[PDB]
Design a protein around this ligand. Structure first.
Ligand SMILES: N[C@@H](CCC(=O)N[C@@H](CS(=O)(=O)O)C(=O)NCC(=O)O)C(=O)O
Ligand SMILES: N[C@@H](CCC(=O)N[C@@H](CS(=O)(=O)O)C(=O)NCC(=O)O)C(=O)O
Lengths: 201, 187
């Protein structure tokens, strides 16, 4: 099994989930500027959308979209409780968090990473992101994980995206619950192992 | 259940899904922070008083509640993760793609880029359709339909995208889709 990734990109969420799920895999880095692998091959021939992550299964299935990849992996190991069981309301609350992170935070940050984005527009995006972070910080008030006291694929995703707040230097003053969360997450061995393998830390 | 909706909005996907899943429910117009702190539609008020937000989450909760209808395939099937893949694509690449074309804070100068990125994604959607994921109707079809209505509304260039057009026609012929459109005062 192969994870197509870029160091520190959104694909880190799927990389963490792979480690939390106990699966062996191979990491393949993608140049997103040139849409090329290290071996020179055209990445568009693997994933036509040209984005990371993508997960290629042993049987040749290609899965794209981080949220789908992460549900596929969680559903494979129900004893790990990375996602509560089908039909259980806490499952769908976890799914609610995944979609919020996907649409409101992950895609909220994207315009800061693109060349086609007008410079003059960046201050608007940053201001929007700082308000969202106020909401996330409140949601984390209980200082454990985002859903309850179980670790889930939503935590892996939120952690991955919130790293970007530090990287672009948004104003995080007094967002203490985000701080506690990031600290709890960075202590997990499976997240330390993912960060090391991507060259982060 | 109550559905909190607005007629044209992303909430129509959740409303089709409720009709396709056989649920009884009430509609409630929104122009609300005391109900949903996010101030968005859709939101689905369950019978224990619990609120579920995020269309993608609502749709999966409903489809899973009626597995024999095959609105979403079972866990550990590849077809389930293909439907989930479409849901996320539509949410993050199409839906959020359109959203700038509505807000006031958005500069005119970002606009050509937004529309061109969207024209590009629609070429990809048209080729994928050459229902969206297999021979069965799913929640991904419901959401794609909802969001593509906006492509028509804001006059994106859909020239040559005949599989999209034929999809919009097949969707509008579904009785439960017609009833949902009808109940929201749309044609
Ligand atoms: N809808 C996709 C989005 C994936 C994402 O946007 N990929 C970025 C990397 S990241 O900015 O989100 O870290 C992309 O590959 N960039 C290249 C492509 O957009 O050209 C899914 O959620 O996985
Ligand atoms: N991440 C949310 C976003 C929901 C969506 O952004 N809702 C819009 C309406 S729509 O453009 O998707 O039809 C919201 O109510 N808008 C709040 C603002 O317009 O006041 C989920 O996907 O449902």
């Amino acid at each position: 099994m192969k994870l197509f990734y870029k160091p520190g990109a959104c694909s880190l969420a799927s990389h963490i989930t792979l480690r939390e799920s106990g699966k062996d895999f191979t990491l393949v880095s993608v140049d997103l500027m040139k849409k090329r692998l290290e071996n020179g091959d055209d990445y568009f021939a693997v994933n036509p959308k040209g984005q990371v992550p993508a997960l290629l299964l042993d049987d040749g299935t290609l899965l794209t979209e981080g949220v789908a990849i992460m549900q596929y992996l969680a559903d494979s190991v129900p004893d790990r409780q990375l996602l509560a069981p089908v039909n259980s309301i806490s499952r769908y609350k976890t799914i609610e968090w995944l979609n919020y992170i996907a649409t409101e935070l992950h895609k909220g940050f994207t315009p800061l990473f693109r060349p086609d984005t007008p410079e003059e527009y960046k201050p608007t995006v940053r201001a929007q992101l700082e308000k969202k972070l106020q909401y996330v910080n409140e949601a984390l008030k209980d200082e454990h994980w985002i859903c309850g006291q179980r670790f889930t694929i939503a935590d892996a995703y939120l952690f991955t995206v919130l790293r970007w707040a530090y990287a672009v230097k948004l104003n995080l003053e007094g967002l203490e619950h985000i701080a506690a969360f990031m600290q709890r997450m960075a202590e997990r061995p499976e997240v330390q192992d993912a960060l090391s393998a991507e060259g982060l830390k």
